[PDB]
From Swiss-Prot, chain A:
This is Ribonuclease P protein component 4. Keywords: Cytoplasm, Endonuclease, Hydrolase, Metal-binding, Nuclease, tRNA processing, Zinc. GO terms for cellular component: cytoplasm; ribonuclease P complex. It catalyses: Endonucleolytic cleavage of RNA, removing 5'-extranucleotides from tRNA precursor. The chain holds residues 11 to 108 of 120 of the full protein. It comes from Pyrococcus horikoshii (strain ATCC 700860 / DSM 12428 / JCM 9974 / NBRC 100139 / OT-3). Consists of a catalytic RNA component and at least 5 protein subunits. Forms a heterodimeric subcomplex with Rnp1. Reconstituted enzyme missing individual protein subunits is suboptimally active, showing each subunit contributes to optimization of activity. Its cofactor is Zn(2+).
From Swiss-Prot, chain B:
Changing R58A: 40% reconstituted RNase P activity. The gene is rnp1. GO terms for cellular component: cytoplasm; ribonuclease P complex. It catalyses: Endonucleolytic cleavage of RNA, removing 5'-extranucleotides from tRNA precursor. Changing F78A: 75% reconstituted RNase P activity. This is Ribonuclease P protein component 1.
Length: 98, 105
C-alpha cells in the first residue's frame, strides 16, 4: 500500500505548513523547523507540496512567510506582470509570473 | 529551546493538525500539533502533564502546556487526542525514531 503512505506524507506536509503559519509570528525558528521537516518528508516520500503552500516559504532560508510581518508582497503589472515577494529575514527575492 | 514563546500561546495550535490519525497509523503520522497527556512514565513528574507536541527528536517529545516539558518516548505511555476528540493510547516505545524517519514502518 504505497497509496496510504503517499496520503500520510501529504497530510504530514499539510500539517507542518499549517503549524508554521500558526507559530511564525511568535517563534520564527520553530516555524523554520516545521518547513524544513516538511521538505525532508517531501523528498523522502517523493510527493508534491500542496499548491497553497509552495510560495509560502522562503526557498533560500526556509522562513515561513507572513506578508506584512517577515515578508514584503507587491503586484507589479505595468510591463511584465508579476508578484514580487521579498523575505525580510534573509533578503531573498522570489518572483512569479502573474 | 525557542519553545518558551509558545507558553501562553497554545491556542494557536487549535484545529491545526490536518491528518486523520488512528491507532494503526499514528506510528507513521505527525505527532507535532497533537494534544497529548502522559498516562504513565518511569519519571514521576511526567505523569499527568498535558499540552501540545511542538517538537520531536528520536527519543523525545517536546510538549507545551502550562510550561515546556521534554519527555522521553521509550519510558512513557501517551494518550493523544485525534481531531474528533477521541483518544489514542500508545506506549512511547512504538514512536522511537526521528520524525522524518518514521514514515516507513
Ligand atoms: Zn529568506
Amino acid at each position: 500500500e504505497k497509496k496510504e503512505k503517499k496520503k500520510i506524507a501529504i497530510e504530514r506536509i499539510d500539517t507542518l505548513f499549517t503549524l508554521a503559519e500558526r507559530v511564525a509570528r511568535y517563534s520564527p525558528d520553530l516555524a523554520k523547523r516545521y518547513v524544513e521537516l516538511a521538505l525532508e518528508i517531501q523528498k523522502k516520500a517523493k510527493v508534491k507540496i500542496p499548491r497553497k503552500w509552495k510560495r509560502r516559504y522562503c526557498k533560500r532560508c526556509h522562513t515561513f512567510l507572513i506578508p506584512g510581518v517577515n515578508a514584503r508582497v507587491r503586484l507589479r503589472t505595468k510591463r511584465m506582470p508579476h508578484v514580487v515577494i521579498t523575505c525580510l529575514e534573509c533578503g531573498y527575492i522570489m518572483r512569479y509570473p502573474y | 529551546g525557542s519553545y518558551q514563546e509558545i507558553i501562553g500561546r497554545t491556542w494557536i495550535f487549535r484545529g491545526a493538525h490536518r491528518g486523520r490519525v488512528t491507532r494503526r497509523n499514528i506510528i507513521w503520522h505527525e505527532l507535532i500539533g497533537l494534544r497529548v497527556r502522559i498516562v504513565g512514565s518511569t519519571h514521576p513528574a511526567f505523569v499527568g502533564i498535558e499540552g501540545y507536541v511542538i517538537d520531536e527528536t528520536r527519543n523525545m517529545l517536546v510538549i507545551a502546556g502550562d510550561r515546556i516539558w521534554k519527555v522521553p518516548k521509550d519510558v512513557s505511555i501517551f494518550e493523544f487526542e485525534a481531531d474528533d476528540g477521541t483518544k489514542i493510547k500508545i506506549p512511547g516505545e512504538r514512536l522511537v525514531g526521528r520524525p522524518e524517519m518514521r514514515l516507513k514502518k
